[PDB]
Design a protein around this nucleic acid. Structure first.
Lengths: 99, 400, 77, 59
RNA sequence: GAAGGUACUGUAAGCAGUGGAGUGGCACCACGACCUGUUGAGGUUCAGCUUCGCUUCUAGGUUUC
RNA sequence: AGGCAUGAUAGUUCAGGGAAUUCGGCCAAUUAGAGCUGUAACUUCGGGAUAAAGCUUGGCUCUGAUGAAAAUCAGAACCGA
RNA sequence: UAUUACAGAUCCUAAUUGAAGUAGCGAUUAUCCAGGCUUGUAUCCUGGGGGCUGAUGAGGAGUAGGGUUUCUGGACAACUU
RNA sequence: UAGUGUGAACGAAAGAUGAAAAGAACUCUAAAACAGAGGGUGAAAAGUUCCUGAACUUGCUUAGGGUUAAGGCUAUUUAUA
């Protein structure tokens, strides 16, 4: 029943390693929705345009890693909002709650 | 002749059916015939396949071209943690076969053994198995059953299981009495122990029940079963490959390139009469994951595991641990081990049951001098330049 | 060759609507196949006695001709 | 419901392709009601349908 | 996620230089493949690689004797 | 929506050998554009002839010639897998 | 008194099985995310990414042929694998 | 006539509510001219290509057989010879 936020890295190279090469951006977003549902235990996940455009930036054939802020939120019926955090470097970024 | 040409048969006929074995470890078919007399002396022992190196042996063969010359030889390395005796069985001889005359158990039983009798340990609230703890039934009962084994049972076998071993949870600092303790798994994963039974080839039966009762509720090590220079049979399940075509499975010649509907097949299944496909004919199916024995595997050296002097040999006067730097798909190997010459059946992480060989070689390669000059401990990912970490700082001391 | 590909360039019309018949008037040859226009006599043969009586009198209105049947009923009854 | 009519008209008014006609999300209700071209000209002078710049091809 | 754990590639970008075939201009500045320094750097490293870390997360459903 | 063994089909690549395969070099591979050399037997003297067989080709900073011409051709430095 | 008795004629006409929830759902660039309208959309529309066609273009227009397929509004029993 | 062929020509399938439409109001579940369930009309639903409604095939319920492909005949204490 709790609402909450979690910042996470999501390792997207290993998510799509040895996968059909033309479906890797399309696969990469199914990993985020899939990963997010598990993290928040929520049936419906919603992905911001800012995160979406960052995944497709290279092309159809994806960034190796991404930071995302998942957010639980009612509409009870509680829904995940995955969304892009910008960051310079991924060195020393553990998965961490927000207040 | 009618075939039109002569060529051997494709594939062996004695290793049918080529299908999966659901054995987790090497099921032993037949133990060596007891000499009788002597000492009972255990035979079989479990070891996990850790990985593989090569070694530079210096050879001494009279009347051959490799007399006093170096010889590079591949070497598998099975990790063997010292395994714990629990039960003891008899087997009466009958007209039908060998039939059992009851198993005696030890005073207590470790909870690694209790895992075997559940598929769902995590669900189980009661977890009530082996409730032989009750004092009246157990103490009186064993001395009745141990009398019956002297009376009837000719052959005696010792039930024994692998030590999974114990540890402390996460961030509690270990070596402290208030901390809750729990089973650490293997390099595979498993806490559930591999129970076997091991025939004791010592004469008199009665004599065996001194030895097999002396050994009971005590750990066995490898150094008092096998010895360096022994020929050993390695029993295990091989390496799973799933479904396979007829070309790769049986090793047939593939057809012309010009074939309609492709060339990866045997062309003639059979003749008109008999009006039927034969068992002998090659065919699409399972490949690998087959239970196999293999004979006459030498053991070069036996291990023990702070000095970590096990990896190094008599020469050089530099101490090197056996694990290659960087550890693939396994673990470090901080236990007793066996440098077996050549290949051993199955993947990394697999439980191989070892066994003493059924009959003796007279071949001179069987009774050779082992003398290892020097062993590889380079990393396997992929090309290895430095044998040890120590070499590194010396070779390239300043970095960033 | 002689089937599907050679059906492609079939856009011209061999026959066109005919004035007398109204039905197969040959444009190049200029004759109604069904009725024979413009020959003054109208085309029928005794080998097509079935197909003739579809065209011939009775099929249409018979505006003048039905009232001349109806007179001959009254005079003889 | 569907603004397929209005982009077809807004192309012919603006002298454009239906590629180029930028409409809004916040005022879908306003544009949806416009059937005529004299209605859809008033929407252009508001700045609610827009001609859009050409996508770039440098030399 | 971290490792002076291990690999593969082969010296990131950006900045600086009495470096650089030369050309052009002011009374030493423009443009310059590339080379030297920062830099065995930067990137990738389990997805079927190893070590240890309480950073974060772990819920329900139906028959069987 | 999810898997990826086998097989069919369309594709890159294959140590050493190089037609031993096969009715048969079928197939595929090699060759290739341009500039400068250099071109045989035979011939109906026109051809053969792109015969064959060699070499050079980038990037960057320049110099010169011919035009009216903002183009095109020739030549030299220096640079690195 | 007869257009008078059917199991067959690769018989005739009419309906219906198993095979079978099986074979298969092709060819054509590539889809993704948030909104709108709804009982209900990846598909209908809007916005924003990522792509394709790449001047003999699924661009803009005509003969021959088709004949209302054009346009607006409402509708989904069927059809547009 | 539908429909086929450039054309001469060729050419189907398809009858029956009840005496009388008295052709099913109104309410309930439902997004609802989906589909029912109540309630009614009529002598009887015969409820709209609706009289009677056979066989093949199928569904549900009840009862037995089954290593002998199944079926038949003879004999009895009905699952055997």
């Amino acid at each position: 029943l709790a609402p909450a936020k979690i910042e996470t890295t999501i390792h997207l190279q290993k998510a799509v390693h040895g996968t059909t090469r033309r479906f890797r951006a399309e696969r990469a977003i199914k990993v985020i929705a899939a990963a997010a549902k598990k993290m928040m235990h929520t049936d419906v996940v919603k992905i911001d345009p800012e995160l979406n455009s960052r995944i497709w930036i290279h092309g159809k054939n994806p960034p190796t890693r991404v930071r995302v802020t998942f957010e639980r939120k009612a509409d009870e019926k509680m829904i995940t909002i995955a969304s892009f955090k910008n960051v310079a470097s991924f060195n020393g970024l553990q998965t961490t709650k927000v207040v | 002749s009618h075939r039109k040409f002569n060529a051997p048969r494709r594939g062996s006929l004695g290793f049918l059916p080529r299908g999966r074995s659901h054995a987790v470890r090497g099921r032993v078919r037949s133990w060596p015939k007891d000499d009788a007399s002597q000492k009972p002396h255990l035979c079989a022992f479990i070891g996990y396949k850790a990985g593989m190196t090569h070694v530079l042996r210096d050879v001494v063969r009279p009347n051959s071209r490799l007399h006093k010359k170096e010889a590079c030889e591949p070497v598998t390395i099975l990790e063997t943690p010292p395994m714990f005796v629990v039960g003891i069985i008899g087997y009466k001889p009958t007209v039908e076969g060998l039939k059992p005359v009851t198993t005696v158990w030890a005073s207590y039983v470790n909870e690694e053994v209790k895992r075997n009798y559940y598929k769902n340990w995590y669900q189980s609230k009661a977890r009530k198995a082996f409730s032989c703890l009750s004092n009246g039934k157990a103490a009186e009962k064993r001395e009745k059953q141990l009398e019956e084994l002297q009376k009837e049972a000719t052959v005696i076998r010792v039930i024994a299981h692998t030590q999974s071993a114990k540890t402390t949870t996460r961030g509690v600092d270990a070596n402290e009495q208030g901390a809750k303790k729990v089973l650490k798994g293997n390099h595979l994963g498993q806490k559930k122990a591999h129970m076997i039974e091991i025939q004791i080839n010592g004469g008199d039966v009665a004599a065996k029940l001194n030895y097999a009762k002396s050994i009971l509720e005590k750990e066995i090590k490898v150094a008092d079963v096998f010895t360096e220079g022994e020929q050993i049979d390695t029993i295990g399940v091989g390496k799973g490959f799933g479904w396979e075509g007829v070309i790769h499975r049986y090793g047939t010649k593939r057809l012309q390139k010009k074939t309609h509907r492709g060339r990866r097949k045997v062309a003639c299944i059979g003749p008109w009469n008999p009006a039927r496909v034969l068992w002998s004919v090659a065919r699409y199916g399972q490949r690998g994951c087959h239970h196999r024995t293999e004979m006459n595997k030498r053991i070069y050296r036996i291990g023990a595991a702070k000095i970590n002097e096990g990896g190094s040999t008599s020469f050089d006067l530099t101490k090197k641990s056996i694990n290659p730097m960087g550890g693939p798909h396994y673990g470090l190997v901080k236990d007793d081990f066996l440098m077996i010459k050549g290949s051993v059946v199955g993947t990394v992480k697999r439980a191989i049951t070892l066994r003493k060989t059924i009959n003796i070689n007279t071949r001179r390669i069987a009774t050779e001098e082992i003398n290892l000059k020097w062993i590889d401990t380079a990393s396997k990912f992929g090309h290895g330049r430095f044998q040890t970490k120590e070499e590194r700082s010396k070779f390239l001391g300043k970095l960033k | 060759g002689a089937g599907t590909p050679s059906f492609g360039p079939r856009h011209n019309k061999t026959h066109t609507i005919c004035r007398r018949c109204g039905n197969c008037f040959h444009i190049q040859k200029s004759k109604c196949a069904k009725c024979g226009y413009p020959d003054a006599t109208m085309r029928h043969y005794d080998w097509e006695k079935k197909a003739h009586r579809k065209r011939a009198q009775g099929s249409g209105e018979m505006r003048h001709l039905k009232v001349t049947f109806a007179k001959l009923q009254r005079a003889y009854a | 419901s569907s603004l397929k009519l209005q982009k077809r008209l807004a192309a012919s008014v603006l002298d454009c392709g239906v590629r180029r006609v930028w409409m809004d999300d916040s005022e879908v209700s306003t544009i949806a009601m416009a059937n005529s071209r004299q209605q859809i000209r008033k929407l252009i002078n508001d700045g609610i349908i827009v001609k859009r710049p050409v996508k770039v091809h440098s030399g």
